[PDB]
């Protein structure tokens, strides 16, 4: 008779509670929003026993596994409602040919540049090696971003053909991995060339890049919305824009889709569908959630146009559309363990790009 919703503690759960209050006003149904500790693990264990919340909020990548275990119920949005969200957001919530969650928010990396040092950021990766030489003459550096995580280096590596798992007919082919194809080889060759020519340092990590950019030492970095707040505290006159292209092809950052799934053990699935479609996934509900804690870019077209008036969210959405949707299969774990090693080995000069990428292929 009631709705119980779980959402991570870093999200605007108070705005979601306000949306639940509006739902209660319109229907009388009490909506209880919670932010349990250790939600990521907590949800699957409780759901496996037929318990847990009616609605669960999380990145789409995990939901696929939840769909394999039968913890998520198939959603039934009509064509009219499906037309309200960007198709690529729907692509992120598809498992075994069925929709298993409602896309809520879109998240992807973007190029953050210092306007004072770089009023006109480069549109191509090939411009960076020369652009750096200029800034080095002034005691600055063109670009510094986390190289320790594949999540940050993949956009350049997979710009011209690279991909984690082939995706077709709403299905991932785990036997088709494009780690060691020509595009990935060219991308990592460019990255290691940047390292070799001293335009970049192999040991640079998240902390070093963040400190360098926020102190005005480097003209550019690559980061997502989560870092914006820190930059705001630094008072750097910064802008967020699209990632540079490689060989004329857009950089393909991983796209994280915050989605809402319906518990398979929920006897109140119609109420969850009503709340999500007619109350949350609207301009008013998304605005209410946004006012508490920003969602960045959103899957709903109507509110996305309003949010895009700020160039930062517009750049985030444009990068996400050109990016690669995060696969929702467990095999990605191995991928994370594989390419990482390659980037560690290829960047260190100990292994060739061919060698490293072929070893990470298997």
Residue numbers in the entry: 5 to 366
Report text from the authors:
Here, we show that a generic and kinetically biased ‘Gembody’ (Gb) interface, previously discovered through trapping in crystallo, can also be trapped in solution by kinetically controlled side-chain-to-side-chain bond formation in a manner that leads to ready generation of complexes; these display ideally balanced interface flexibility and yet relative complex constraints, in turn allowing rapid cryo-EM structure determination, even of small targets. Ultimately, after a survey of in-solution covalent bond-forming methods exploring differing natural and unnatural amino acid residues, we found that Cu(II)-catalyzed oxidation at a pivotal C12 residue site (together with the presence of needed Gb ‘gem’ substitutions previously discovered through iterative X-ray-guided engineering) offered a route to direct and rapid, high-yielding formation of disulfide-linked homo Di-Gembody (homoDiGb) without side reactions (for example, off-site oxidation) to form a robust covalent interface. Furthermore, the success of DiGbs for high-resolution structural solution is enabled by their relatively small mass contribution to the imaged complex while increasing the maximum particle diameter for better particle alignment. In summary, our plug-and-play DiGb strategy improves cryo-EM resolvability and resolution of small proteins through constraint and increased particle size with a simple and robust workflow and can even enable simultaneous structure determination of two challenging targets in one dataset.
